[PDB]
Amino acid sequence: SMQEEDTFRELRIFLRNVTHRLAIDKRFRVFTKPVDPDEVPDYVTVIKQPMDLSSVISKIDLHKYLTVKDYLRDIDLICSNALEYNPDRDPGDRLIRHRACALRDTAYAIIKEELDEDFEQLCEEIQESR
Ligand SMILES: Cn1cc(Br)cc(N)c1=O
Ligand SMILES: [Cl-]
Numbered sequence: 001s002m003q004e005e006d007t008f009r010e011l012r013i014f015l016r017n018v019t020h021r022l023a024i025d026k027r028f029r030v031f032t033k034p035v036d037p038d039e040v041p042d043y044v045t046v047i048k049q050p051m052d053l054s055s056v057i058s059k060i061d062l063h064k065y066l067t068v069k070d071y072l073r074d075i076d077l078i079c080s081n082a083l084e085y086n087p088d089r090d091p092g093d094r095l096i097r098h099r100a101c102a103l104r105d106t107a108y109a110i111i112k113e114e115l116d117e118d119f120e121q122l123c124e125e126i127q128e129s130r
Helices: 002-023 026-031 053-061 068-085 091-114 117-129
Strands: none
Touching: 002 026, 002 053, 002 068, 002 091, 002 117, 026 091, 053 068, 068 091, 068 117
């Protein structure tokens, strides 16, 4: 129905706004673009599902997210990719891990404060109907 198309449009507007707020945060610059294989040629070898905020915007715009749960799986992937690729004790790795956890935590905190649970429940019920 349109009403269902209107629901998913509202979802996309909401997700673009959350993603924009994460992307303009200086802490998260490293997560804003895919990893350049020239800088890190073994990335694509270790990380099977690269994810970044640019890719998340592309996926919103392609109507790939029908729920905030599916969006948060991609945010979780940005975080777990960073924990897996940068696991060492050295400060460079610890800084990226802290920034990755802070991304996950910020996305979840914005969604806790600004997502209506009944809106998410509607999205989940339309998705389950398809
Ligand atoms: C996410 N990300 C980005 C860059 Br640039 C370099 C890394 N080692 C990494 O894990
Ligand atoms: Cl820095």
